[PDB]
Amino acid sequence: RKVYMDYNATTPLEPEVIQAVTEAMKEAWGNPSSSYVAGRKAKDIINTARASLAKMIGGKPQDIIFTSGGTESNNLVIHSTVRCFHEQQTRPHFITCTVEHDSIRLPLEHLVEDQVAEVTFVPVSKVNGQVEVEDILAAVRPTTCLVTIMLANNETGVIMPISEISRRIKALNQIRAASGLPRVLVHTDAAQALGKRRVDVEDLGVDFLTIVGHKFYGPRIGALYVRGVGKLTPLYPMLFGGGQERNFRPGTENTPMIAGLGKAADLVSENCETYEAHMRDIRDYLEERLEAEFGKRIHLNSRFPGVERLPNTCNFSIQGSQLRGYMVLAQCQTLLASVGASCHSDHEDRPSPVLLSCGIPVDVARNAVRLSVGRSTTRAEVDLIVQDLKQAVNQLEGPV
Amino acid sequence: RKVYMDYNATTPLEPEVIQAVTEAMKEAWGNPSSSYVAGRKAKDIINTARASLAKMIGGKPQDIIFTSGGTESNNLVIHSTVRCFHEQQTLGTRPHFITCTVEHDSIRLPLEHLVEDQVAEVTFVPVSKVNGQVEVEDILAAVRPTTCLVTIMLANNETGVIMPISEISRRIKALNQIRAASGLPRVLVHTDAAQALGKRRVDVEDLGVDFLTIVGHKFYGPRIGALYVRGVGKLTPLYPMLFGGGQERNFRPGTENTPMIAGLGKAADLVSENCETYEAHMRDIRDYLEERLEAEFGKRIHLNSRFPGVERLPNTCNFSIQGSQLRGYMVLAQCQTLLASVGASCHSDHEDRPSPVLLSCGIPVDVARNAVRLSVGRSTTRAEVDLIVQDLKQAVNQLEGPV
Ligand SMILES: *Cc1c(COP(=O)(O)O)cnc(C)c1O
Numbered sequence A: 001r002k003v004y005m006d007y008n009a010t011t012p013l014e015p016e017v018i019q020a021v022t023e024a025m026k027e028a029w030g031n032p033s034s035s036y037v038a039g040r041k042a043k044d045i046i047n048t049a050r051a052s053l054a055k056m057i058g059g060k061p062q063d064i065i066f067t068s069g070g071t072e073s074n075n076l077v078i079h080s081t082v083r084c085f086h087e088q089q090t091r092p093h094f095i096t097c098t099v100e101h102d103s104i105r106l107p108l109e110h111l112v113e114d115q116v117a118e119v120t121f122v123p124v125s126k127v128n129g130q131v132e133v134e135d136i137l138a139a140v141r142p143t144t145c146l147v148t149i150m151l152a153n154n155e156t157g158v159i160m161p162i163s164e165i166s167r168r169i170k171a172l173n174q175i176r177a178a179s180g181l182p183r184v185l186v187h188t189d190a191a192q193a194l195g196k197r198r199v200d201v202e203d204l205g206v207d208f209l210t211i212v213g214h215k216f217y218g219p220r221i222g223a224l225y226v227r228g229v230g231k232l233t234p235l236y237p238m239l240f241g242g243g244q245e246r247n248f249r250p251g252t253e254n255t256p257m258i259a260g261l262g263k264a265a266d267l268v269s270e271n272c273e274t275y276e277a278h279m280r281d282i283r284d285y286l287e288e289r290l291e292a293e294f295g296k297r298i299h300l301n302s303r304f305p306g307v308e309r310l311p312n313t314c315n316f317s318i319q320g321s322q323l324r325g326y327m328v329l330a331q332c333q334t335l336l337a338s339v340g341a342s343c344h345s346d347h348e349d350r351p352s353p354v355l356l357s358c359g360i361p362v363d364v365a366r367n368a369v370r371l372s373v374g375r376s377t378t379r380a381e382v383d384l385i386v387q388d389l390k391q392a393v394n395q396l397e398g399p400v
Numbered sequence B: 001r002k003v004y005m006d007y008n009a010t011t012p013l014e015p016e017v018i019q020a021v022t023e024a025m026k027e028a029w030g031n032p033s034s035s036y037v038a039g040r041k042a043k044d045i046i047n048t049a050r051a052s053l054a055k056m057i058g059g060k061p062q063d064i065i066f067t068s069g070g071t072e073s074n075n076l077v078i079h080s081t082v083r084c085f086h087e088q089q090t091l092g093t094r095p096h097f098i099t100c101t102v103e104h105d106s107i108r109l110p111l112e113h114l115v116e117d118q119v120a121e122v123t124f125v126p127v128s129k130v131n132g133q134v135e136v137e138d139i140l141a142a143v144r145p146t147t148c149l150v151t152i153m154l155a156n157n158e159t160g161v162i163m164p165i166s167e168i169s170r171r172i173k174a175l176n177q178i179r180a181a182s183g184l185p186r187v188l189v190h191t192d193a194a195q196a197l198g199k200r201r202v203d204v205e206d207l208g209v210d211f212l213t214i215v216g217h218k219f220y221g222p223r224i225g226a227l228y229v230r231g232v233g234k235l236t237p238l239y240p241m242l243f244g245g246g247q248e249r250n251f252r253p254g255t256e257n258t259p260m261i262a263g264l265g266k267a268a269d270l271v272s273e274n275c276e277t278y279e280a281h282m283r284d285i286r287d288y289l290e291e292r293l294e295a296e297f298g299k300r301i302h303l304n305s306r307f308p309g310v311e312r313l314p315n316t317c318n319f320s321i322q323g324s325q326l327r328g329y330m331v332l333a334q335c336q337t338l339l340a341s342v343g344a345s346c347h348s349d350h351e352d353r354p355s356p357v358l359l360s361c362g363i364p365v366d367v368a369r370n371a372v373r374l375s376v377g378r379s380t381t382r383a384e385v386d387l388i389v390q391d392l393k394q395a396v397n398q399l400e401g402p403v
């Protein structure tokens, strides 16, 4: 009955993923560290999954480190960077943008509050909702250690120019090296891109990349890509313990979850283009129907000029004092969506800081609703929720 | 055809746990923070599991914080303590910790790290080489004006020896009244109860601790964990290691792993419902096991889990058979049925190095080098014991026979 359009918040598990998790729970329950066959069996599942993730993003198995999820992966990159700077050695400097996920913004703000590091939160262009390359390069100081920019924004869907950033940073690094300055590394939070658009680390040129399983129909765990970890790129751990994950992330491996993530990654490798095309077809049809139904009263908050965006995201607002996002969704009987990051669902009456950062007017941001379609969404489901929205609007704003 | 006796390394999942996880994956996949029924349904599964864990250890739901496993839980309490120390002062200087010499890597290493980085000072109290237990008097004797945390494992994973946590907590509570009188900050107590859950009753009111680590895969649950914090936000502070979405009341952000939490809650219910049965059964099997080992090997056997005057886990039997050729890993390499280990899995890459824990417990190097750790479980039978004992006899004879 309901129509789910909140895939950016989380995705359901593919049946093959569920199957993998289940078989691992039953068949490969042994401690992966144990010498006997049962332990070696779990280890192989883990090795296979590491290769799956590596293949998904075009990196190598040795560049993948499993973590409990996106939040851990993001905090890890930031924590490692601070340690690296102190080992190389005044505080480390970070460069990021104003629309990152809480797992990037907050750990950085925390470092600032504690006076451990200095951070330049580069405002995104209020024109295209994208961080601009020149603003990032201009922010680099002798103490700059890491540039962390999300590949795609979870609320707007806007793609950031990661590949250009890495390229410009590489160029600037050649000068720093000759000058005796350490290199500025680059990390990208790719949580919302995986499974929606091709993600290749060689194309992106990044040194770190965050992988989030529950964004691409996988389990609630994740990983962190680190270009030639320990050799080409340094990684200092947050956790200390039994030596798992080459001591970069100790703790008995969660084989079942890893198995699920691996299978999830395989499906992306094999079908990413199919998913992307279907999402784009559905999202475009969705925007077409919303425009036909609401005309001049609707504003498409995800259609910025000159920039790319996820194929599945359509953040929009309908003009009207009575059409606050959370009020509209409350009146919907079929549509399941959100007004922004799930992480902020306890204050839905407040305009999204992210949309405001993107130049979206306050009253437009207050009425914003984020629709994010998925692999299974159909045109018939789009029609259903457009009609659901029509009734919700007519009830709140009334006829115009 | 194999007989598993390495439950202290990890345990298989109970059928019900597996079902709980599978059900959650299929029916409760929504984001717990979402403003619609799908999200509300996952949150309820999480709340139920929180209550389940609380009941298992005699605490309250509000005092349970889910984590990714034992390692995270242990690192978290140590991190939080460092933060707390400085915060209280702010309201150059280093916090002091007290632990013992036989803690798991997830307690020992984070503490060594702080010492190396000059972030804190730590007193690694040596356990008794007589009873392999850390003594209450030695811990209290190590207390300094700057001591803020005493962390002692409830049960050792290699020997099975039970540490006097309730008495440690009692003596610290009395000391804190004296410290408060002079205006000094209080000393908190944490216990790594990884190896005790599901094997013996664990009651936070009995133990008197402020923090307690819970490890799912040690009691037939999923590979995640939790941290008990006594009246968190009211009687005990907890400073987060991770920052982000506000989940777990911001003590541990990150979209909740509902299926794993579902499994953990179910594993906890089983312990709550059947702990006495599990314990009594393990004790019977383990005691029968030692009887048979002594019967078959006689005076050649050394029982390394039989220290005088102390309690021990009901399922553990660490032992050694004398002989230059009977190194633990060598013996196990010859076994065709028995599945065990020579120490914490975490150190399997160097099974040829005598256990530092056994050595710290007074076990002579000749005995320590030949140690094998047998840890039985809920399903282990006396028949299976007889099998591995014959498997050991066979193995021993091969090792000592013509080259
Ligand atoms: C989902 C997401 C994350 C990770 O969040 P978790 O709660 O740990 O799953 C990080 N960044 C972005 C942009 C995301 O959408």
Ligand SMILES: *Cc1c(COP(=O)(O)O)cnc(C)c1O
Binding pocket: A242, A250, A251, A252, B008, B069, B070, B071, B072, B074, B103, B104, B106, B153, B155, B156, B157, B192, B194, B195, B215, B217, B218
């Ligand atoms: C298993 C165990 C832990 C936790 O270890 P993980 O590898 O994170 O599951 C902590 N302490 C002790 C004594 C343990 O046996």
